[PDB]
């Protein structure tokens, strides 16, 4: 309860950690720790009745967030781990169920059958992109196919639980916590050309309430980099 | 020199052989390893995780996320069928495209048991009771609440716990996992009544496969 890191502090009370490993350290690298290990709270999204889902690309959502956005442009390479806190706050009269998963290397498919999606439509800079519950048209040039029952990757949406996941059920649970190590082939990669993780939030059983209650339940995502090291002189 | 004598089956190319092969690029000094997390040693370790079962197909929910939810509402009849699906293997049933059923369409002989986890994704003030009757292979499907109670069953109270685990064998009639209303959904004022139920499936960890083949989920 009431953990602190750097100059930021959140309040907690079960944590699922990666593929069984904890994030740890390894020309020559430098390791900065006093100015990157803090909780960058992304701003809150709203969960309405006919909502579909959200996704963030992970070393892209912190590209403008303070000093971590400066070390992405100054240093060429780097490798980090992450620690994700998700918590939505509803009363005892709401109902629903989320799925918080963290997909590594989530390559998405374009709407047009021949092209590839552009940069502005894969990742919103510190802003959540949205799935849809209908199809995306074929006639538009280059946009991400966001049919939520195929999860944008051409896969079954039910089988997405093989990745490290955690259920948020508003009857009994309220929050979720994930710890993800660095999963890549090369031991140190670029941070602009590549997005090695993807955090997805999908509502399976949709929100429902009576007449009178507040018609939206906000979600809060809080990310903190762990054991980061860059490469340069 | 040394006298040899070639047997039949000498200059043939068997596609499933195992012989020492000449290397094309020697003196290469190959790239060494690196400890990447999440190594898979056996394909059963994919099937041990739990996956949501599309138990609500009905021809208009297959292109949506309502394929995974079972509608539960407070009706007026006492004793009614909530759902029911056979365990007949691969014959267009609901365990076909799940993560358990997608590995077991690569093999032709398999045997084991199955964990079946349910979960009540409803309000926190709503209560009720459910039967989970499992009929063995050979016996018929129960056509009533009373003769579903006489078979093997587990009564699931929603108010105390919100997840009921049921273990059941599955072999290559084969059984039914029908579920019945015991009482209605009693709910207070200013709460919605239409609650939904998710269903999970897994492998019970002692099951084997044999005789690999190719999958029929292709052109």
């Amino acid at each position, epitope marked *: 309860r009431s953990i602190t890191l750097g100059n930021s502090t959140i309040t907690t009370q079960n944590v699922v950690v990666g593929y069984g490993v904890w994030p740890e350290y390894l020309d020559q690298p430098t390791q900065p720790d006093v100015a990157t290990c803090r909780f960058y709270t992304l701003e809150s999204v709203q969960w309405m009745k006919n909502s579909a889902g959200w996704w963030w690309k992970l070393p892209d959502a912190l590209s403008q967030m303070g000093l971590f956005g400066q070390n992405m442009q100054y240093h060429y390479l780097g490798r980090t781990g992450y620690t994700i806190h998700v918590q939505c706050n509803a009363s005892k009269f709401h109902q629903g169920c989320l799925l918080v998963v963290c997909v590594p290397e989530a390559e998405m498919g374009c709407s047009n059958l021949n092209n590839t999606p552009e940069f502005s439509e894969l990742s919103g800079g510190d802003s959540a992109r949205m799935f849809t519950d209908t199809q995306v048209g074929e*006639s538009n040039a280059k946009k991400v196919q966001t049919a939520v029952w195929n999860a944008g990757m051409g896969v079954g949406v039910g089988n997405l639980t093989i990745f490290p996941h955690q259920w948020i059920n508003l009857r009994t649970n309220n929050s979720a916590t994930l710890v993800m190590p660095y999963i890549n082939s090369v031991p140190m990669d670029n941070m602009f050309r590549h997005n090695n993780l993807t955090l997805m939030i999908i509502p399976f059983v949709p929100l429902n309430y009576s007449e009178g209650s507040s018609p939206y339940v906000p979600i809060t995502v809080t990310i903190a980099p762990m054991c980061a090291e860059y490469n340069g002189l | 020199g040394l006298p040899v004598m070639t047997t039949p089956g000498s200059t043939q190319f068997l596609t499933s052989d195992d012989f020492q092969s000449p290397s094309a690029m020697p003196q290469f000094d190959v790239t060494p390893e690196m400890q990447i997390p999440g190594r898979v040693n056996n394909l059963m370790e994919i099937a041990e995780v739990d996956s949501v079962v599309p138990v609500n197909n009905t021809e208009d929910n297959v292109s949506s996320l309502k394929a995974y939810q079972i509608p539960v509402q407070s009706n007026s009849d006492n004793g009614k069928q909530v759902f029911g699906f056979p365990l007949q293997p691969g014959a267009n049933n609901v365990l076909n495209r799940t993560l358990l059923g997608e590995i077991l369409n690569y093999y032709t002989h398999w045997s084991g048991s199955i964990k079946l986890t349910f979960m009540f994704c409803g309000s926190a003030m709503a209560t009720g009771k459910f039967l989970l009757a499992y009929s063995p292979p050979g016996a018929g499907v129960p056509k009533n609440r009373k003769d579903a109670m006489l078979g093997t069953h587990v009564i699931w109270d929603v108010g105390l716990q919100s997840s009921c685990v049921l273990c059941v064998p599955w072999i290559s009639a084969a059984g039914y996992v029908t579920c019945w209303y015991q009482t209605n959904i009693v709910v207070p004022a200013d709460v919605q009544s239409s609650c939904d139920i998710l269903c999970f499936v897994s492998a019970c960890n002692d099951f084997s496969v044999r005789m690999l083949k190719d999958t029929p989920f292709i052109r």
Partner: antibody
Amino acid sequence: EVKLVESGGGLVQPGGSLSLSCAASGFTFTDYYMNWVRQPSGKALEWLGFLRNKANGYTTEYSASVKGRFTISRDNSQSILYLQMNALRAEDSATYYCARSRYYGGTYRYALDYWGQGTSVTVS
Amino acid sequence: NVLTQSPPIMSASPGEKVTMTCRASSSVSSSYLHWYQQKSGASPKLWIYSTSNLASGVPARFSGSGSGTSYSLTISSVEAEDAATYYCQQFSGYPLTFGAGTKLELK
């Protein structure tokens, strides 16, 4: 009750521009998909494009023939719906409707239940 | 994908049982085919959605059926207010194509 009126039609030169407007009353405007269906003089109907509700990000999906020429948008303050037309040709003389969509189950079938009274646009 | 209705003009006396068809070029799913009814000089109205379900406020004489690539709408008893034009709609990919139209003239 669902009450949809639309206005803005009239005569306009080929190669010109014209902006229609469809007003909605009697329901929550930020919850339903809003379509646009035109129809020539006693012929078969044609579909133009719709605009999604607030829970899906207010995106648009035009048809193939009017892609780049027409533009569907809504106004943030009050409940009103627009359609910005550009580079009109002789075959765009039709009667324009303003339909609503709804969720039947929790699914979205592609039906159009409530239609407007229909405005007319001619070119010459 | 195109829809071809048949027949274009169809006449029926009051009291008989009549039917029309709506044929697609490719396979259209059964939950994405709807029927409309437009009277003379009025806005169209939704009649049958998801190929077998009645709309709100429609009489119970109408009933749709069919699957695959051939669908049909049959009227049990013809009355005096159901003389109009009927369209069928589909969706397999964008765009949403309407049918040609079947006109029902009373006898």
